[PDB]
Design a protein around this ligand. Structure first.
Ligand code: SF4
Ligand code: SF4
Lengths: 427, 432, 432, 427
């Protein structure tokens, strides 16, 4: 689950952070943070997504609450004028106000201030209530889904497919990807496969997405949970409210990519889609397997320690699993039941109590199994580096690269670059 | 004069007091800063710093709950102090208030007296308490405020007057001194046969500095409380950067050691006076080495005067760096056409600039465009502003996550100064 | 192995022997190089250098006429020596043969004995004679040949064996050591309590270094013949850069001082062994400073390993720099995919590269393209090659007229090395 | 005149250097230096011109004579194969081979090797015989003109003016600019004036020029010597061989620009051109004078020492002369009769014997008159800088900028930048 013990595995970030991880990759929107600088300032350079157009989500926006403003009351005045500023200066399609510990405490009415602002100025303003102290990032991810109820609701109908018009295919198959964040532009590797099968994605939920894309989500024919289970709540609420079926898959590894595409085929039901999807997987497996053989000698048989940190990390396992590296995973008492249940299957009906111990447990735990690389996410990078151990970030946020068939092409490259690096013996 | 406005901050220049106060404690050896606030506050500060120095950084959380509406956090602050003390056993701990915990008043001193009663924990583990709400001041002031607190918490008092013995020179360092600035400042001192006690000392804590597989609490640190204790006695104290006046005052009242303070160490005059004050403090003369570098700098001014004479620049930096870069540039005939600061800060009279703004990068882009910046000085956040003008960036300042070398650049002194002229010359030349 | 070809040189990598031999004399104090050839030869070499150091450079001309078909230049060489001697009165003069004058054989020694008879001029004004035809070898070999000549012309002989007294350490510097390399080499030595005699010393001659309104003959010089004379006696001689083996041999036969030579001072190993050889020569240990820097470098390798591990680079440099950069890069997992050199030069076995080419920038562009250079290290002349690939440049080497800071960069040692990793990392990162 | 005294004012560079200064700014051509590296290597980064297209003159080309090649005879073999290389690799319109001391000495037959190469390969190869030891740069400049006799010769007729077609103007007035080198692109400031008046420039002799432009030079109606008197020999030979009249002027300063345009008007004779040229000058003087008044206070009354170094420097004097700065010029015994005769008019029927003394004479001579800046060309830059005196390069080669009406706009800016620089008091 999750609870928090002071200075013990106490790092993870608020629900606000969590909400902002999920809503920011909606590029053309204005993303106003309603707090003091602790909140905005830093999380702004940010991480991950790549846009193929608008870069508004890259502009740090925030009502910059001075102390006077919290000698209560002014907090609201500012926000109202902060939206007026966003709307006139940048004219966004829509505006998202994120709530924060200070303003939640002094009782700030985000919702009502937002609605007033919608009406007076004419730009949809969506309130995300997830100040940090509510809980963890996951919680903020979920609160981000909930708010997309007052915006997903077909506040708008699916565009008419473009006059382009792929012939003999039922180009009329609409779908959604929930939780794909086009991080490092990785999704650019999957989208062409979808397009080939004639699957129109109404919205990649926070992956090169635009506001007007989200509006139309209820008309999807099949929703798909991309790793993220933090948002099971949207797949289910869409299912229950519009009848739209769903599944879970990842786009990391040959197996999952093939499987994700496979159960697209059988969920929205067509024999032409189905025959074509086998043809596609046919072609791609052929391609990728062939391009990977030369590399098998080099990485094959290397031991990887694996650590989960909120990072959707069982996905990567699917990948390197098939290649042939022995994997050892572990969660930390403050793990989801997801992690621990998966850590279970993978190996040993015992440890996922690696405790709240940082490198202490972690480092020595690498040593224990004689692991070759540690894989875990940016937090645990410097414990790996300084403990003179090879490392490989679990972020699609980054500039690699790792999904679909062609993803693995640089996953492999990235593993060798580090675990064959002559710098390691030199320290 | 200083201009301000309201009401939405667009791509903020400013970072929190409570982070800036956190890298001051980060410059004590074997230390551990502790935010009294919810966990995201620290998890954000942490990311900020590691992406800068690209090296791990220790930072923990009071972990205020949704019930930070009920029990102030009495329980939280206390269990945090007991936890760390018993888990990594710091040489020092930093107790910092956030915007959240300050919203009450947050019984700072008290929670610490609530953790100055129970205490099967030794005690003798010093604790620096700082008041630094996200909602006031800024990074630099934040930083300067945890130096006031560091000074006052550690040894200033009992002894006096007769506590001024050796040839030890205290240096009060400000926030925008890099390890490479700090090394210059220390090597510079040592070369006069003095011995620096740097307060505090990021040189010690922040680079690649260790030989254990794991370094838990910053052990690769700067100031040992041990040796900070001895700042009481010492010939003089040098104050580097105006942001630290209130700390030079605290330092100076509790001991009797006489300050000779000031500027960021940029340009001829700035380093001339630094060396002089050192020659005086120690009687012996300016080493032949810095005699030579002054000549090297003068030549760099002759060679770069073509390109920099009359350059329009726009600077987006903490007040100290502003004044430091303004001076440097003005010794070249360069005009700073646009200065944007994060918060009011001393350095009134504005320095010689007719005016400066508090209002961050959106303001910079438009002020820069107004007077026709040729070049913009600022942090990684400024790339975008610069790139959105048609203009070169020279980053300085304290978020630089996009530059491998940056956290460590020596800006200060004769070579530092001269290298900065090379860089502006080169940027200006190639974008023309 | 080393590859070559013919027949038209396109954007040449190479510069003349007779220029390189000219900056070696340029690293003696109060000296004046004299080309034996027509005037354009010098007027060209001059431009080249001043655009590099961006500081004046003394260089004169035998001034061979169309009648350099008749009287060899007897008269010309002689009147040139008498003219300078009586006009600026050098501490040393360099006598250097060009392509033109060598076309005969040019009675070098003789014209100098033709100016070792007449001579109302004092004499006692030493003269170094060097044979350096534009048509053979190259800049670096040019340079290493005027060091052999310098060594042999100044004091080597009479004394011996018993001439090896103090704790004075000789350093034979090669051509691609910048003033900032030489200062690191000198400060590095001095920090062990040794005292360096740099042979020769561009540190002294080339930056902004003077206080007279006019400096006629380089007075801001490196090596005093005065002090070069004392190289006879000295504990050991350190040889920096393989181009200098023939000079290490000359130096070593005439005195008895034992050499410990070699690499460009780049990377861990390179500097480790530099410091060790120093600890050994002097007994005392490696100062805490360089103990730290080695820790700093190792960290810069961990942080830049992501970007540099497996980078394709292409290098267009003198053989020394090649081997120096190759080593540094290989310690990172970087592949040098294309190495282009100006002339055969020792460093046989090729070092560990399967091969290297002599054939200059047009060759580099195509070799680079062949193996997919991600990055190109070279001089200002390489911009165009780099810009014509789609690729970043990091200049090093001896024409850099487009970069204000460059003639002066310290490449060497732990910080030098680490700063080079920051630079490649940063270029690689932003062009991706 | 010129003769040369060993190590005394002995710097100036060969006739080869001189020839290359004159022929290089023909951009599309291949410019092969037939020598050892002393000759090419360095002069290659080069200086000055700006092209509006082809950059081949920027590629260093040279036959790279090893010592074996001068154990005679191979010298010629190489060159022949060197042209074959230039012609196959770069397919230039034409190719220029420059002669050099070593190859002139051992008797190398450039002319014949060139002609052989022309025929075998089919690309015009022009031989420029001006090895360094013949004399000075000026000499090389003159030898560059001579060679353009075997190429100017209408080896080609003027293109037909483009279908653009400026109406009511006699767009049919062809002219040449001899010695304008479009240095720092400065000529881009004059060309639009010429275009307005309807003067077509057949060729700007070595200023953004192309081979096929030179060919057509004999059909010009009026030739114009731009400063360069080193090439009076082409203006005259063109005049005597095709009857084409000429004049001398400079494009530096309001006066000369207006005067150069004026005697264009009265040489090729038209009352419409004439009335229009007054109109133009009318407009431009109005413009420039107005844009210069605000600067007059700042530079007015400053004393400039002026030194000639082969630099066409009496031109700049015309400029700052009118602005109001007191000018003191001087030549050095090794000066043309041009300099000395002009130095004469300007001031004093005595000194132009400043001797061969470098900064010695020069520096103290600046001090003597209490000069504010010294102006002389890149050689004397560092004697000025290090003698702690302001400086201003006499190169149009550079990135400023100084000709025509709009040129003065940055001449003034460049003067202030240096002589108002606070760096001067600081040393
Ligand atoms: S923990 Fe609270 S105050 Fe801190 S960054 Fe998160 S929302 Fe903002
Ligand atoms: S022509 Fe003569 S002086 Fe001129 S560069 Fe060539 S060889 Fe040297």
């Amino acid at each position: 689950g999750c609870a928090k013990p002071k200075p013990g595995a106490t790092d993870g970030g608020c629900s606000f952070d969590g909400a902002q991880i999920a809503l920011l990759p909606v590029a053309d929107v204005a993303h106003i943070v309603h707090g003091p600088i602790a909140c905005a300032g830093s999380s702004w350079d940010n991480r991950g997504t790549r846009s193929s157009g608008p870069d508004l989500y890259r502009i740090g926006m925030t009502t910059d609450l001075t102390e006077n403003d919290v000698i209560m009351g002014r907090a609201e005045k500012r926000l109202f004028h902060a939206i007026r500023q966003a709307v006139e200066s940048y004219s966004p399609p829509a505006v998202f106000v994120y709530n924060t510990c200070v303003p939640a405490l002094i009782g700030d009415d985000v919702d009502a201030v937002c609605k007033a602002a919608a009406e007076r100025f004419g730009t949809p303003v969506i309130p995300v209530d997830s100040a940090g102290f509510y809980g963890t990032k996951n919680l903020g991810n979920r609160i981000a889904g909930e708010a997309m109820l007052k915006y997903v609701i077909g506040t708008r109908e699916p565009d008419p497919l473009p006059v382009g018009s792929e012939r003999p295919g039922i180009r009329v198959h609409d779908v959604n990807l929930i939780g794909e964040y086009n991080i490092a532009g990785e999704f650019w590797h999957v989208l062409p496969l979808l397009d080939e099968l004639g699957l129109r994605v109404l919205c990649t939920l926070a992956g090169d997405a635009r506001y007007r894309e989200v509006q139309t989500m209820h008309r999807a024919e099949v929703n798909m949970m991309v790793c993220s289970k933090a948002m099971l709540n949207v797949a289910r609420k869409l299912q229950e409210t519009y009848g739209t079926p769903w599944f879970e898959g990842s786009f990391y590894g040959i197996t999952d990519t093939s499987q994700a595409l496979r159960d697209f085929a059988r969920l929205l039901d067509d024999p032409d889609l189905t025959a074509r999807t086998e043809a596609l997987i046919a072609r791609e497996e052929a391609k990728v397997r062939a391009a990977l053989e030369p590399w098998r000698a080099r990485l094959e048989g290397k031991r990887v320690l694996l650590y989960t940190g909120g990072v959707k990390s069982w996905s990567v396992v699917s990948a390197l699993q098939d290649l042939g590296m022995k994997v050892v995973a572990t969660g930390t008492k403050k793990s989801t039941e997801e992690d621990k249940a998966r850590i279970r299957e993978l190996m040993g009906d015992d440890v996922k109590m690696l405790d709240e111990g940082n490198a202490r447990v972690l480092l020595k735990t690498v040593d224990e199994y004689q692991a070759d690389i540690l894989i875990a996410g940016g937090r645990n990078m410097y414990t790996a580096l300084k403990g003179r151990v090879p490392f490989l970030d679990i972020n699609q946020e980054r500039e690699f690269g790792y999904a679909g068939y062609d993803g693995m092409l640089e996953l492999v490259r990235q593993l060798c670059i580090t675990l064959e690096c002559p710098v390691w013996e030199a320290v | 004069i200083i201009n301000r406005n309201k009401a939405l901050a667009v791509s903020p220049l400013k970072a929190s007091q409570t982070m800036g106060a956190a890298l001051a404690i980060l410059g004590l050896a074997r230390s551990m800063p502790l935010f009294h606030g919810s966990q995201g506050c620290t998890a954000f500060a942490k990311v900020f710093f590691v992406r800068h120095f690209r090296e791990p950084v220790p930072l923990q959380t009071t972990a205020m709950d949704q019930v930070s509406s009920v029990m102030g956090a009495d329980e939280n602050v206390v269990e945090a102090l007991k936890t760390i003390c018993e888990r990594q056993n710091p040489s020092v701990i930093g107790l910092l208030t956030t915007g959240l915990s300050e919203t009450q008043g947050c019984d700072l001193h008290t929670a610490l007296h609530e953790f100055r009663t129970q205490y099967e924990e030794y005690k003798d583990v010093p604790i620096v308490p700082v008041n630094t709400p996200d909602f006031s001041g800024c990074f630099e002031s934040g930083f300067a405020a945890a130096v006031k607190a560091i000074v006052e918490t550690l040894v200033p008092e009992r002894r006096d007057q007769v506590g001024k013995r050796p040839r030890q020179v205290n240096v009060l360092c400000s926030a925008n001194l890099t390890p490479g600035d700090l090394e210059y400042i220390a090597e510079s001192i040592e070369s006069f046969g003095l011995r620096p006690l740097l307060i505090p000392d990021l040189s010690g804590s922040l680079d690649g500095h260790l030989d254990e597989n794991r370094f838990n609490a910053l052990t690769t640190g700067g100031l040992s409380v041990a040796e900070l204790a001895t700042a009481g006695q010492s010939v003089a104290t040098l104050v580097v950067g105006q942001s630290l006046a209130g700390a030079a005052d605290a330092l100076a009242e509790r001991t009797g050691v006489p300050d000779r303070r000031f500027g960021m160490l940029y340009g001829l005059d700035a380093v001339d006076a630094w060396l002089m004050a050192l020659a005086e403090i120690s009687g012996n003369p300016v080493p032949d080495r810095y005699k030579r570098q002054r000549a090297q700098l003068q030549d760099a001014m002759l060679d770069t005067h073509f390109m920099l004479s009359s350059a329009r620049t726009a600077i987006a930096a903490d007040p100290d760096l502003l004044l430091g870069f303004d001076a440097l540039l003005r010794s070249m005939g360069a005009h700073t056409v646009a200065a944007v600061v994060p918060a009011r800060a001393a350095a009134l009279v504005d320095s010689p600039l007719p005016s400066v703004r508090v209002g961050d990068l959106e303001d910079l882009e438009h002020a820069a465009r107004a007077g026709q910046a040729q070049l913009v000085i600022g942090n990684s956040h400024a790339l975008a502003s610069a790139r959105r003008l048609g203009v070169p960036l020279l980053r300085a300042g304290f978020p630089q996550y996009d530059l491998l070398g940056g956290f460590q650049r020596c800006w200060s002194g004769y070579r530092g100064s001269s290298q900065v002229l090379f860089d502006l010359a080169n940027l200006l030349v190639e974008h023309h």
